[PDB]
Amino acid sequence: APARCRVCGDTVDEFLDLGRQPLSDRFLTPADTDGEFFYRLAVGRCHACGMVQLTEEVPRHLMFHEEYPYHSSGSSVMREHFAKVAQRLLATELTGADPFVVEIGCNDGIMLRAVHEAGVRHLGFEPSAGVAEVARSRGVRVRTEFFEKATATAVRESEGPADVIYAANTMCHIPYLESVFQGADALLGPDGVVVFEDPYLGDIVAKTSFDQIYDEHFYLFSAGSVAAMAERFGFELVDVERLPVHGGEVRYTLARRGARTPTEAVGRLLAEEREQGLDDLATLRTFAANVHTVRDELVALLTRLRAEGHRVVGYGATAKSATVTNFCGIGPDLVSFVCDTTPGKQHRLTPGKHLPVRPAEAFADPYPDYALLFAWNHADEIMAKEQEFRQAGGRWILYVPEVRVL
Amino acid sequence: ARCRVCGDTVDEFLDLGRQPLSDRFLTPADTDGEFFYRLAVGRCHACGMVQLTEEVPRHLMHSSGSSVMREHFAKVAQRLLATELTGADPFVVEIGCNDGIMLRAVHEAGVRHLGFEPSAGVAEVARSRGVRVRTEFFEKATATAVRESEGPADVIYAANTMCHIPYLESVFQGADALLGPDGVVVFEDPYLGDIVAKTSFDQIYDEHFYLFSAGSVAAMAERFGFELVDVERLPVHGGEVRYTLARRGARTPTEAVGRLLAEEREQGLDDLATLRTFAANVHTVRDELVALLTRLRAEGHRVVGYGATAKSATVTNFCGIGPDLVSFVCDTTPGKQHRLTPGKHLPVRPAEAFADPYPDYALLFAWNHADEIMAKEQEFRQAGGRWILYVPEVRVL
Ligand SMILES: Nc1ncnc2c1ncn2[C@@H]1O[C@H](CSCC[C@H](N)C(=O)O)[C@@H](O)[C@H]1O
Ligand SMILES: Nc1ncnc2c1ncn2[C@@H]1O[C@H](CSCC[C@H](N)C(=O)O)[C@@H](O)[C@H]1O
Ligand SMILES: Cc1cn([C@H]2C[C@H](O)[C@@H](COP(=O)(O)O)O2)c(=O)[nH]c1=O
Ligand SMILES: Cc1cn([C@H]2C[C@H](O)[C@@H](COP(=O)(O)O)O2)c(=O)[nH]c1=O
Ligand SMILES: [Mg+2]
Ligand SMILES: [Mg+2]
Ligand SMILES: [Mg+2]
Ligand SMILES: [Zn+2]
Ligand SMILES: [Zn+2]
């Protein structure tokens, strides 16, 4: 039995096998290492509805729990981004004298804080307690529960209809989309929409950014697959917008079928996907081959540098990096440690390959010869600020969209 | 009508009539001197450069006030630092640094730099941030002297400045003297493709002498011995492109350059007929806007303008929109408050005046900031107020 599609039930053709992987966000102490969870990370395309998806679901409680370490507000580019998201929704998707904004996955409340500060009624759903708490400390209302049909329906009954349900980097995390969209159907008001933004399949294929494939990214959405999924659930894809964040995303707007006229952007992006051949399983096999080439070149490079007696360190202990280190077999012999600004990631070992994580100050004591940039979506900001590294002769190693030394 | 780049003949395709200076806001008792010029635009048939047909005398003509641009220029500085200012002792020069937001980031990274900014007031603001500034125009002579005193530059950068300078040959001769071996000129300005696609004719006003495209920039570069080697679309200021020019043969154009030139072929942007279609669309916008405002006044509704943009002068004057059609314009800029807008003399009032009381319609001149403005005016929406937009077409929201 190959996979069955989690949207429509039909058969999924697997095209990339990334091997045995840990949970991306589970950093370890030495005592945890024997007990570490692993699963098989592989990606396939449903031949009927085109949805690209992982072939095994990781249980949601293992990934989303009290001590989930990713706080959205750590990143300044994302603070700016979500302020603008709040402005967009406030400007375009509110009706009447008491509108209501709901967010799935509001994390530390980055976006909804602005909605609150504008005096608009709102509610977040965030089952991870630690981040929920920080959101709450900013004045956001947050239910520490998973958004799904039942929870959404109950909120319709207490809080009334929602003008918009927004989700960033959350919808692709949720295999149970039918239940989310049943929820949305119950909760949304008459001109209500679901607006969600996630890592875009088109960007992943174009950039060979395979580190975007990890436990929390169950779906790799495209406009083609979203339009088909919406239809199945009695919704309709009515707007799309490309965003540059997180290595390349699309924001999808779904309305109940018939309620709105799809914008011209929708057809334009579909034509782009057709140009890219995104829906041809062959294009996806070519991507899988390019992934294997990146692995080969990156391991060869790190292996040479090790042989030359150079010091190589990683920069940014990203969630994505677990896929790289584990798929490529990169341990401490090839990358001595990883520098990271996140207090809870520091003084722990990275998932699966157990690279020690050190604070960002450790980068300078002394500077290494090479820095492997896992935090590649922040390349300009990082490379610009680390002047002394470059003055000491330091070189950057990048692996997106290909392996190169800068 | 002669091309300011190559000297060949320029074919006019849009005449926006008599216009004032776009930032010459009048006190109520000096509306008698008022300067007007003829604002029109043409394409050089030889090099393709799109440009105003009459230059506004330069003698008659604060970046960090906008949060969006402060954020943008932080990122520009990081881009330049990360990618072009590598080597032992690099040097970035900026043409038109204004209050120095961008170069402040360069200075704080410890990188040698120099801004050119002939406006003394902003130049001093830039100095107060630690930016090294010369209160001079960048041109062949001044650039050459900088080469002598400071050595070669890795980058010469300009934002919203190159398109204001008719004398580009002098700028590029300057860059040729001043740049190092692998040096580049990087400039970003409002993009002709976006103006045509959006019918955003309010981008056409005294300060914007050129409406650059990849095609016209490639031809200009080659004329001056440079080469278009990179491009990047930017969303700021209603749609821009950042062009990267290297000395001919020094670098290999990126795949982006080709892709943008393909977009321009798809758009037909180098066919005068396409530019005529744009002109016809501009006339339609005028017709539809004036018809709407006329009807709304006839229906007894109250209409206020929102944001006294420099660009808005083009709109009010071309469309003949005076205070009978729009009562005043609210604006957050102190230097503009309590003055009359150029040419059509719309009164300008602080933001607080919008809610005293709320009008029935608000005509959005600051259309680049639609979300930010509409998001913050919640009570206006709750009270049934509606927004009138004219980009990319006339409509009520
Ligand atoms: N079914 C569900 N309902 C609500 N939130 C969920 C969920 N499943 C996962 N989440 C939350 O979704 C978030 C993924 S991380 C993305 C956070 C934030 N939206 C941002 O874009 O930066 C986590 O905070 C996780 O706890
Ligand atoms: N030849 C020249 N050299 C240097 N600066 C010039 C110039 N001609 C005009 N300027 C300056 O260029 C600026 C154009 S306005 C744009 C300012 C800023 N770069 C921004 O993007 O916001 C003004 O500050 C003006 O004084
Ligand atoms: C921008 C930036 C991020 N980081 C780290 C913080 C996060 O753990 C990580 C970004 O990855 P994330 O996308 O998993 O949040 O990189 C740094 O260490 N230094 C930096 O300058
Ligand atoms: C963003 C914003 C701008 N404005 C004004 C300020 C400036 O005069 C003008 C912006 O024009 P500019 O883009 O030509 O600088 O609009 C407001 O009045 N309110 C606002 O909320
Ligand atoms: Mg296997
Ligand atoms: Mg329909
Ligand atoms: Mg530092
Ligand atoms: Zn399917
Ligand atoms: Zn010419």
TrEMBL record, chain B:
Record keyword Transferase present: yes
Pfam families membership: Methyltransf_13 (PF08421), Methyltransf_14 (PF08484), Methyltransf_23 (PF13489)
Binding site for dTMP 2: 310, 331-332, 336, 376
UniProt cross-references to InterPro entries, sorted A to Z: Methyltransf_Zn-bd_dom_put (IPR013630), Methyltransf_Zn-bd_dom_put_sf (IPR038576), MeTrfase_14 (IPR013691), SAM-dependent_MTases_sf (IPR029063)
Protein name, as recorded: Sugar 3-C-methyl transferase
Xref: CDD domains: AdoMet_MTases
PANTHER family xref list: BLL5978 PROTEIN, TRANS-ACONITATE 2-METHYLTRANSFERASE-RELATED
